[PDB]
DNA sequence: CCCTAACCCTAACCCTAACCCTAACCCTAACCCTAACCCTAACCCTAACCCTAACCCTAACCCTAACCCTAACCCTAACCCTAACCCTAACCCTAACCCTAACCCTAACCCTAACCCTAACCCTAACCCTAACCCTAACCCTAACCCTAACCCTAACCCTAACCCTAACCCTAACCCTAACCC
DNA sequence: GGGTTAGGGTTAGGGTTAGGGTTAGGGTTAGGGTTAGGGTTAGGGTTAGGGTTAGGGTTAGGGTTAGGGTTAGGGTTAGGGTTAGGGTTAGGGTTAGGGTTAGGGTTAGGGTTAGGGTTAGGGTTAGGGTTAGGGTTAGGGTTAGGGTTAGGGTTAGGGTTAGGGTTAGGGTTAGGGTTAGGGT
């Protein structure tokens, strides 16, 4: 509402941009935004979740890049893992060069 | 296929094919509003249900029930029978692990 | 509940099995620890009735009449 | 006025045809007669279990209204995970 | 040498019966013995592939008992005892 | 339209003083603490049983009122003959 | 006090047992044969009751180090109008879904009879168990060490959000292939 | 076999339904610094392991033959398929009014430090009592017969009983006075 009301946060703007790159001239209904926005907010709490425990067992106090690579190897399944461990390193490579 | 009679068990295959291809809820909304309200009385009184809460409960309860029937069916076809029965529901619940 | 099941087997120590016969014989402690497997434990005795010997002469042989 | 409250006839509110349309989506071909009372027993245990955890979250917040982000937070713990009717 | 066949013919026919007479089964058909070597090589593959992943994270070359107690805990079957 | 409370008196009114007044007629000298929940479990399985037979006679006459002669007729069958409350 | 639903005489019209009367089945008391079942004389388990003797749990020690009270601190959850909305009212029709009742037609369920195929044994020919019998390859614990990741600043800018708007998604009519009719 | 009765892709016409900018704020972040914590290096004491030293004892094999369980293939019938009206009934809406709650301004309340100041937990032992094989020493499960005898069939001739003639009271359904069980 607008009576000095709070503003929610949604990964809905970002999903629309991805839809455009993979398939041009196609649209999403607002009911289908709701199923998709929940998935992006559920994979965040499983991939981050295994990372917290992995840090504690080792005794180390920081969740760095190696930890979000062991979590992707364990939580995800078979060939959606090799294609996602590889994709992530490529984006970390570019950021190290420039920010 | 005189409209007067189609042999037993042939109207239902048309029913299965048409029903599996649409998503509308199959239990009526006003009666299910009440079952939830009666079950809530024991846990507390003066509880007010927003419209969405009785919608979610309809889309989870239909989904548990649609599933038990597919597993009851798999059990029935095992014994050489072609019909679900009261005994078959209990084997599906012991194996899935819910009853204990 | 474990200790009371050690007197019944005539021993003075709560060893690992006596722990299963007390967490698998209860109805509010077998619905909490219901997936856990206890090391070097065992199984609770049960034989389904249909199998127990009761074929009653079996039959189909040379008319026992 | 509204001088009546909800009795316990509701559990028979699910009709005989509704359990014959949620079972024809399941593949069932010849439903037997006694199934209708049993399917009103399996639904009856389930609706209470999502409900007790739903009320327990609401009383934590000292409110009086069971909003859907409470049903969705109860349904995750038991086992399922409804995505959609909630955030 | 870990002769492939020898390792799986290791769960021999007597011990695929005595692990099943602890469940109640009274008569066992001949082909149960082949299928039950199949379902204990697709269970060990899943437990021993998630103990290697934790071991590599700590840069160690020995698979300790605690790691197997953490591989089993994830898949829904906690083990109490041979670990802490 | 509805008394907000629908508790229909949940085995209530049998307060600690009432159970400590009936017991003293009996001869009890030092009532223990846990008895109060149990004595609200024995009264409960009795008030139901006289009642189930009492309604069963009234529905036989098709009337909608449970008169005292119906309670005296039900109490004879179980075993205790109340003399005179109804006659 | 203040009332609305309950009762109870009453008053009339069929429904519905009773009584009777032959005339039929059905179910009793006898009457043999036939097979369940208890006894029996074996064989193979199954505890019960002692006796070790040995293999550890349970008492002792010391020591060192995570707990803990008194001092200053400072986020932070405490109560209260308040607007404002959103959810329950008893407000209200209405045709499309529940029922239902008489019906056929497959299935669910038994009997017998072949007939494979698993279970109990005995002979044997190993393989896995121990006593361990070395050695050495990773495992952890100091020192020390930059490199990184936090913490306040500050100045943009990039993300909601209500406001429009028209365009793909809708019921709805009208008119063709496509299987059950079953030889 | 039938010519057969059965639905299934198109399509105007409103009626919503995501698109679509568009400022307009509204938080959020991307720039700037310092500074302390944390992973990362090196060395040395010490546990998997493998590799033959051997050995013994179960133990998992192979054959074989009754036993038995199973799965077929015929005799009888329970959930299908109508049907359409009528009794609900769950929908399409109303106001409308009150119930509740996210927006605010102030105080318990939990780290925090910190150097002592301990006390209780963690190793760290040698003695107690050992607790589970083994050898006797009496009780129970199977295994499979044989001789009775106690049921499970039969008839036929009485003893009920069902059906088919026959009547009128003991119940119904409204219809009044009358009252008494909630409801404050």
UniProtKB/Swiss-Prot annotation, chain A:
UniProt modified residues of type N6,N6,N6-trimethyllysine:
59
Q: Which GO terms describe its biological process?
A: antibacterial humoral response; antimicrobial humoral immune response mediated by antimicrobial peptide; defense response to Gram-negative bacterium; defense response to Gram-positive bacterium; innate immune response in mucosa; killing of cells of another organism
N6-malonyllysine PTM sites in chain numbering: 90
Instruction: Give residue numbers for the modification (N6-succinyllysine).
Output: 8, 90, 94
Describe the processing and modification events after translation.
Answer: Monoubiquitination at Lys-8 (H2BK34Ub) by the MSL1/MSL2 dimer is required for histone H3 'Lys-4' (H3K4me) and 'Lys-79' (H3K79me) methylation and transcription activation at specific gene loci, such as HOXA9 and MEIS1 loci. Similarly, monoubiquitination at Lys-94 (H2BK120Ub) by the RNF20/40 complex gives a specific tag for epigenetic transcriptional activation and is also prerequisite for histone H3 'Lys-4' and 'Lys-79' methylation. It also functions cooperatively with the FACT dimer to stimulate elongation by RNA polymerase II.
Q: N6-(beta-hydroxybutyryl)lysine is carried by which residues?
A: 8, 59, 90, 94
Residues where Dimethylated arginine occurs? 53
Which residues are glycosylated according to the annotation? 86
Q: Which cysteines are joined by disulfide bonds?
A: none
Q: Does the keyword Glycoprotein apply?
A: yes
Residue(s) of cross-link: Glycyl lysine isopeptide (Lys-Gly) (interchain with G-Cter in ubiquitin): 8, 94
User: Any keyword Oxidoreductase?
Assistant: no
**Where are the N6-(2-hydroxyisobutyryl)lysine residues found in this chain?**
8, 17, 20, 31, 59, 82, 90, 94
The chain residues annotated with the modification N6,N6-dimethyllysine are 31
Residues modified as N6-glutaryllysine: 8, 17, 20, 82, 90, 94
Q: What keywords would UniProt list here? A: Acetylation, ADP-ribosylation, Antibiotic, Antimicrobial, Chromosome, DNA-binding, Glycoprotein, Hydroxylation, Isopeptide bond, Methylation, Nucleosome core, Nucleus, Phosphoprotein, Ubl conjugation
Residue numbers bearing the N6-methylated lysine modification: 90
The protein's name in its UniProt record: Histone H2B type 1-K
Organism whose genome encodes this protein: Homo sapiens (Human)
Q: What residues of the intact protein does this structure contain?
A: 28 to 126 of 126
Swiss-Prot record, chain B:
Q: Where in the cell is it found?
A: Nucleus; Chromosome
Q: Which GO terms describe its biological process?
A: chromatin organization; epigenetic regulation of gene expression; gene expression; nucleosome assembly; telomere organization
Top-level taxon in the UniProt lineage: Eukaryota
Which positions does the record annotate as the modified residue Phosphotyrosine?
6
* Assigned GO CC terms: extracellular exosome; extracellular region; membrane; nucleoplasm; nucleosome; nucleus; protein-containing complex
Give the sites modified to N6,N6,N6-trimethyllysine: 1, 21, 44
Q: Which residues carry this modification: N6-glutaryllysine?
A: 21, 44, 80, 87
Instruction: Please report the PTM annotation for this entry.
Output: Acetylation is generally linked to gene activation. Acetylation at Lys-87 (H3K122ac) by EP300/p300 plays a central role in chromatin structure: localizes at the surface of the histone octamer and stimulates transcription, possibly by promoting nucleosome instability. H3R2me2a is present at the 3' of genes regardless of their transcription state and is enriched on inactive promoters, while it is absent on active promoters.
> Residues where Phosphoserine occurs?
22, 51
Residue list for modification Phosphothreonine: 45, 72
Annotated positions of the N6-methyllysine modification: 1-2, 21, 29, 44, 87
Record PTM N6-succinyllysine, positions in chain: 21, 44, 87
Q: List-wise, which residues carry N6-acetyllysine?
A: 1, 21, 44, 80, 87
Residues modified as N6,N6-dimethyllysine: 1, 44
As stated in the Swiss-Prot or TrEMBL entry, residues carrying the post-translational modification N6-crotonyllysine are 21
Question: Which is one GO molecular function term here?
Answer: protein heterodimerization activity
Positions of modified residues (N6-lactoyllysine): 21, 44
| Coiled coil residues, start to end | none
Which family does this protein fall into? Belongs to the histone H3 family.
Entry protein name:
Histone H3.1
Full-protein residues shown here are 37 to 136 of 136
Curated annotation (Swiss-Prot), chain C:
Quote the subcellular location field of this record. Nucleus; Chromosome
After translation, the protein is modified as follows:
Monoubiquitination of Lys-55 (H2AK119Ub) by RING1, TRIM37 and RNF2/RING2 complex gives a specific tag for epigenetic transcriptional repression and participates in X chromosome inactivation of female mammals. It is involved in the initiation of both imprinted and random X inactivation. Ubiquitinated H2A is enriched in inactive X chromosome chromatin. Ubiquitination of H2A functions downstream of methylation of 'Lys-27' of histone H3 (H3K27me). H2AK119Ub by RNF2/RING2 can also be induced by ultraviolet and may be involved in DNA repair.
Which GO MF terms does the UniProt record name? DNA binding; protein heterodimerization activity; structural constituent of chromatin
On this chain, the residues bearing Phosphothreonine are: 56
Alphabetically sorted, this entry's keywords are:
Acetylation, Chromosome, Citrullination, DNA-binding, Hydroxylation, Isopeptide bond, Methylation, Nucleosome core, Nucleus, Phosphoprotein, Ubl conjugation
Q: Which residues carry this modification: N6-crotonyllysine?
A: 54-55, 61
* N6-(beta-hydroxybutyryl)lysine PTM sites in chain numbering: 31, 54
Q: Which positions carry N5-methylglutamine?
A: 40
Question: A GO CC term?
Answer: nucleosome
An example GO BP is: chromatin organization
Q: Which residues carry this modification: N6-(2-hydroxyisobutyryl)lysine?
A: 10-11, 31, 54
Record has Acetylation as a keyword:
yes
* Cross-link (Glycyl lysine isopeptide (Lys-Gly) (interchain with G-Cter in ubiquitin)) at residue(s): 55
Q: Which residues form a coiled coil?
A: none
* Entry keyword DNA-binding: yes
Where N6-glutaryllysine occurs, residue numbers?
31, 54-55, 61
Superkingdom to which the source organism belongs: Eukaryota
Q: Which residues carry this modification: N6-succinyllysine?
A: 31
The family this protein is said to belong to: Belongs to the histone H2A family.
Q: How does it assemble?
A: The nucleosome is a histone octamer containing two molecules each of H2A, H2B, H3 and H4 assembled in one H3-H4 heterotetramer and two H2A-H2B heterodimers. The octamer wraps approximately 147 bp of DNA.
Q: Which protein is depicted?
A: Histone H2A type 1-B/E
- Organism placement in taxonomy: Eukaryota, Metazoa, Chordata, Craniata, Vertebrata
What stretch of the whole protein does this chain cover? 66 to 130 of 130
Swiss-Prot record, chain E:
Indicate where the modification N6-(2-hydroxyisobutyryl)lysine is found in the sequence: 13, 26, 41, 59, 61, 73
Where does this polypeptide localize? Nucleus; Chromosome
Q: Give residue numbers for the modification (Phosphoserine).
A: 29
- List every position bearing N6-glutaryllysine: 13, 41, 59, 61, 73
Q: Which residues carry this modification: N6-lactoyllysine?
A: 13, 59, 73
Modified sites of kind N6-(beta-hydroxybutyryl)lysine: 13, 59, 73
Its GO biological process annotations read:
chromatin organization; negative regulation of megakaryocyte differentiation; nucleosome assembly; protein localization to CENP-A containing chromatin; telomere organization
Query: Which residues are reported to carry the modification N6-butyryllysine?
Result: 13, 26, 59, 61, 73
Q: Does the keyword Nucleus apply?
A: yes
User: Where are the N6-acetyllysine residues found in this chain?
Assistant: 13, 73
UniProt key word Aminoacyl-tRNA synthetase: no
Keyword set for this entry? Acetylation, Chromosomal rearrangement, Chromosome, Citrullination, Disease variant, DNA-binding, Hydroxylation, Intellectual disability, Isopeptide bond, Methylation, Nucleosome core, Nucleus, Phosphoprotein, Ubl conjugation
**Effect on the protein upon substituting residue 22 to L:** In TEBIVANED4; results in early developmental defects when expressed in zebrafish embryos
Physiological role: Core component of nucleosome. Nucleosomes wrap and compact DNA into chromatin, limiting DNA accessibility to the cellular machineries which require DNA as a template. Histones thereby play a central role in transcription regulation, DNA repair, DNA replication and chromosomal stability. DNA accessibility is regulated via a complex set of post-translational modifications of histones, also called histone code, and nucleosome remodeling.
Family statement: Belongs to the histone H4 family.
Record-given protein name: Histone H4
Q: Which gene encodes it?
A: H4C1
Full-sequence range covered: 20 to 103 of 103
